[PDB]
C-alpha cells in the first residue's frame, strides 16, 4: 500500500497512535524529531510528533516528505473550539486552514495573506470525504470546517471573536495550517483531524489539562479507522 | 569546497546575490521554491528566496539541507531597526534569534519559549566572527545582536518597545529565527545577516519601499565578501 505519514504536535497526541496501531516500530532520529517506522495492513506508516507550533510542524512535515517519502499525511491531535456545536471530545476535519497570526496589513494585505501564497490552504477532498463516511457509519458527529493555526495558545473571548469574524474558523490550534501548507507545496494529500480539548477561552488551560489525554485518544482512534480504509 | 546554501526571503533579496556572484545558475524547482545551483570559487552555491514568513523560510531551509545537502546556510536580506545605532543601510549579524510572536503564557511559559526548545537560537560563532573581521577590514560598522522574528510586519512604537524590553532585540524580521532553528536541528552552521530598511515604526512601510533595493544589495554584497573568505 501507500506509505502514510501520521503526525501529532505533542508526544501525548502520538502515544495513543503508537498504542492503537500496536505494531513494532523502529525509531529513526532526524532533525530533532523521532520517526516511528512500522508496517500496518501492508502499508508503511511513519509516526512522529513535531513539537508545538508552526516552525516545528513545518520542519517535521518537510522531513516526512523529503526523507521518508510519505505519499499522504494524516495529522491527529487536539484543538480549541470556536463554535458552540463543537463540544469537548467532538471531532472535526479541516476543509481549509489559515495562519491566523500572519499580519502584512502594513502593506494593505488581508490578514492571513502572504504574497505568493493564499489565506486558505486546502486539504484532500478524498480524505475528508472518507472521514465523513466513517463518522456517519459509526454514528459520530464530524464537523467539516476552517481551522485557524497560529503560534499562540488562544485563551480569550477577544481572540476567539477575531478568529470567527475574520476567518469563520471553527477550531484553533498551532500546527494544522503549516502541515497542510507543506503538503500542498509538495503535492502530498493531507487530512487534518482534531478533537476538541477546550473552548479557547479564559479557562482553556484548565480544560486542556483535563481533556488532553481523552481528546488525543479520540482523534487517534478515528485516524486509525481511516487508515483501516486506506 | 563546502556546499553553501544562500537564502533570502523575497526575490528582491536574492536578485543582487545572483547578479553579484555572476556565475551560471541552473534553476531547480522543489516544494514551491526555485533553487539556483552554481559553482563559485570551487564551491557549490545554492541560492533561493523562501517567500515571506516563518513557515515559508522553515520549509525552504529544510529543503536546502535535506534535498541539496548544503553544509552551511547564509541568510541575507533586510530588517527593521529597533536600536538608534542601527541606521538605514547598516548591517548586523544575529548572534541569537527569537520567535517574538510565540505565546504559551497560558501555561506559564516565558514569551518566545516552546517546550522541547529554547527562547534563543544560536548561530555560528565562526561565521559571525568572520563577518566582524571583514567589516573591520572594510571599515564598516557591523553590529552583533539579537534578531526577533515573527509573522507580522512590525510598524508601531508599542511593538518595538515590547521587542526591546522582552528580548533586547536589535532588529526585527520574519524569517531569521526559523532559518537558524532549522539549521540548529540539523547541525548545519548558519549566519543571519541583515541590512536595515526601516525603523519598524509607523512609517516603516514607506521606508521599506524606498530602501529595499539598496539595503538588499548592501546585505548581498557583504554576504559575497564572506563567501570569498570561505
Ligand atoms: N485554545 C488553543 N489554542 C491553540 N492551540 C490549541 C490546541 C492544540 N494544540 C495543543 C498544544 C497547546 S500549547 C501547550 C504548551 C505547553 C503545555 Cl504544558 C501544553 C500545551 C499545541 O500543540 C496546540 C488545543 N487548544 C488550543
Ligand atoms: N519592520 C519590519 N518588520 C518585520 N520584518 C521586516 C523586514 C524583513 N523582511 C522584509 C519582508 C517584509 S513583509 C512585506 C510584505 C509585502 C510587501 Cl509588498 C513587502 C514586504 C519580510 O520578508 C520581512 C524589514 N522590515 C521589517
Ligand atoms: Mg495540491
Ligand atoms: Mg548546533
Grid coordinates in use for B156? 508601531
CA B158, CA B149: separation in Å to the nearest integer? 16
Q: For B111, how many CA atoms within 13 A lie in the half-sphere containing its CB? A: 11
**Dihedral pair phi/psi, residue B44, rounded to 5°:** -80, 130
CA A109, CA A106: separation in Å to the nearest integer? 7
Among B53, B99, B103, beta carbon nearest to A114: B53
In chain B, what are the domains?
A: 1-230 (3.40.50.1580)
The helix/strand/coil state of A59 is: helix
Q: For B168, how many CA atoms within 13 A lie in the half-sphere containing its CB? A: 8
In chain B, the largest separation of any two C-alpha atoms, in whole Å, equals 52
Return the DSSP state at A131.
Answer: H
Grid coordinates in use for B45? 552555491
Helix A176-186 and helix A54-68, axial crossing angle in degrees, nearest 10:
30
CA B201, CA B10: separation in Å to the nearest integer? 21
Minimal CA–CA distance to B3: which of B50, B37, B49, B48? B37
What is the stated resolution of the deposited model, in angstroms? Answer: 1.4
Report how many Cβ contacts below 8 Å link chain A to chain B.
117
Give the gap in angstroms from C-alpha A137 to the nearest C-alpha of chain B. Answer: 37
CB of B97 closer than 6 angstroms to any ligand 2 atom = no
Q: Which residues contact B145 (CB under 8 A, 6 or more apart)?
A: B83, B92, B94, B95, B168, B169, B170, B171
- As for ligand 1, residues whose beta carbon falls within 6 Å of it are A 9-10, 52, 78-80, 153-155, 172-175, 197-198, 200, 204, 208; B 104, 107, 115
Q: How far is CA A138 from CA A143, A225, A226, B208, in A?
A: 14, 10, 12, 55
Within 10 A of B85 (CB to CB), how many other CB atoms are there? 11
Q: Are B36 and B60 in contact (CB under 8 A)?
A: no
Does B158 participate in catalysis according to the annotation?
no
Minimal CA–CA distance to A191: which of A85, A90, A61, A86? A61
Q: Do B181 and A99 touch (CB under 8 A)?
A: no
CA A77, CA A210: separation in Å to the nearest integer? 15
CA A230, CA A43: separation in Å to the nearest integer? 9
**Dihedral pair phi/psi, residue A63, rounded to 5°:** -60, -45
Which atom of ligand 2 is closest in space to residue B173's alpha carbon?
5
Q: Are B78 and B51 in contact (CB under 8 A)?
A: no
CA A79, CA A74: separation in Å to the nearest integer? 15
Q: Are A145 and A169 in contact (CB under 8 A)?
A: yes
Q: How far is CA B210 from CA A114, A150, B199, B203, B214, in A?
A: 20, 31, 12, 11, 8
The catalytic residues of A are 13, 198
| Centre of ligand 1 from the C-alpha of residue A153, in Å | 5
Going by DSSP bridges, is the β-strand pair A142-149/A91-99 parallel, antiparallel, or unpaired? parallel
Minimal CA–CA distance to B7: which of B39, B36, B28? B36
**Dihedral pair phi/psi, residue B75, rounded to 5°:** -100, 135
Q: How far is CA A72 from CA A91, B66, B68, in A?
A: 20, 19, 23
Grid coordinates in use for B204? 516603516
* E strands present in B114-215: 121-122, 142-149, 169-173, 190-198
Return the DSSP state at A103.
Answer: B
| Centre of ligand 4 from the C-alpha of residue B184, in Å | 5
Within 10 A of B91 (CB to CB), how many other CB atoms are there? 22
Return the DSSP state at B43.
Answer: E
Cross-strand partners of B144? B93
CA B57, CA A104: separation in Å to the nearest integer? 16
Within 10 A of A178 (CB to CB), how many other CB atoms are there? 31
Q: From A114, which residue of chain B is nearest by alpha-carbon distance?
A: B52
Among B55, B114, B204, beta carbon nearest to A181: B55
For chain A, the residues whose C-beta falls within 8 A of a C-beta of chain B are 31-32, 51-56, 58-59, 62-63, 66-67, 99, 101-107, 114-117, 151-153, 155, 177-178, 181-182, 185-186, 204-205
Burial of A217 (0-12, 13-18, 19+ CB in 10 A): buried
Grid coordinates in use for B98? 527569537
SS3 content of chain A, % helix, strand, coil (to 5): 40, 30, 30
**Dihedral pair phi/psi, residue B157, rounded to 5°:** -60, -40
- Ligand 2: residue of B52, B57, B94, B151 to mutate (most ligand atoms within 8 A of CB) is B52
For chain B, the residues whose C-beta falls within 8 A of a C-beta of chain A are 31-32, 51-56, 58-59, 62-63, 66-67, 99, 101-107, 114-117, 151-153, 155, 177-178, 181-182, 185-186, 204-205
CA A75, CA A190: separation in Å to the nearest integer? 8
Going by DSSP bridges, is the β-strand pair B26-30/A26-30 parallel, antiparallel, or unpaired? unpaired
Q: For A56, how many CA atoms within 13 A lie in the half-sphere containing its CB? A: 26
Taking the mean position of all CA atoms in its chain, how far away is CA B22?
22
Q: Do B151 and A102 touch (CB under 8 A)?
A: yes
Give the gap in angstroms from C-alpha B153 to the nearest C-alpha of chain A. Answer: 6
Q: For A198, how many CA atoms within 13 A lie in the half-sphere containing its CB? A: 23
- Ligand 1: residue of B99, B102, B103, B107 to mutate (most ligand atoms within 8 A of CB) is B107
Residue B185's H or E segment, with its range, is: helix B176-186
Q: Are B215 and B88 in contact (CB under 8 A)?
A: yes
* E strands present in chain A: 4-8, 26-30, 33-40, 43-49, 72-81, 91-99, 121-122, 142-149, 169-173, 190-198
Minimal CA–CA distance to A63: which of A186, A177, A175, A147? A186
Q: Which of B85, B144, B198, B229 is catalytic?
A: B198
Q: Are B57 and B50 in contact (CB under 8 A)?
A: yes
Grid coordinates in use for B159? 511593538
Going by DSSP bridges, is the β-strand pair B72-81/B190-198 parallel, antiparallel, or unpaired? parallel
Q: Say which residue the cell 471531532 belongs to.
A: A91
Q: How far is CA B46 from CA A79, A134, A194, B34, in A?
A: 39, 46, 38, 10
Amino acid at each position: 500500500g501507500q506509505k502514510i505519514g501520521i503526525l501529532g504536535a505533542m508526544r501525548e497526541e502520538i502515544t495513543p497512535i503508537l498504542e492503537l496501531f500496536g505494531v513494532d516500530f523502529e525509531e529513526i532520529p532526524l532533525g530533532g524529531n523521532v520517526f516511528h517506522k512500522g508496517v500496518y495492513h501492508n502499508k508503511e506508516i511513519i509516526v512522529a510528533y513535531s513539537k508545538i507550533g508552526k516552525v516545528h510542524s513545518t520542519l517535521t512535515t518537510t522531513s516526512m516528505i523529503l526523507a521518508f517519502g510519505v505519499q499522504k499525511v494524516l495529522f491527529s491531535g487536539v484543538a480549541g473550539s470556536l463554535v458552540k456545536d463543537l463540544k469537548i471530545n467532538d471531532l472535526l476535519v479541516a476543509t481549509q486552514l489559515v495562519q491566523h497570526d500572519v499580519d502584512l496589513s502594513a502593506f494593505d494585505h488581508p490578514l492571513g495573506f502572504i504574497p505568493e501564497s493564499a489565506i486558505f490552504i486546502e486539504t484532500s477532498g478524498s480524505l475528508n470525504a472518507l472521514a465523513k463516511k466513517i463518522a456517519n457509519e459509526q454514528h459520530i458527529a464530524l464537523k467539516e470546517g476552517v481551522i485557524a493555526s497560529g503560534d499562540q495558545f488562544v485563551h480569550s473571548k477577544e481572540r476567539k471573536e477575531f478568529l470567527v469574524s475574520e476567518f469563520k474558523a471553527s477550531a484553533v490550534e498551532m500546527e494544522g495550517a503549516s502541515v497542510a501548507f507543506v503538503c500542498q507545496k509538495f503535492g502530498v494529500p493531507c487530512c487534518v483531524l482534531r478533537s476538541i480539548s477546550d473552548n479557547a477561552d479564559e479557562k482553556a488551560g484548565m480544560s486542556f489539562d483535563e481533556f488532553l489525554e481523552k481528546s488525543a485518544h479520540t482523534s487517534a482512534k478515528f485516524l486509525k479507522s481511516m487508515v483501516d480504509e486506506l
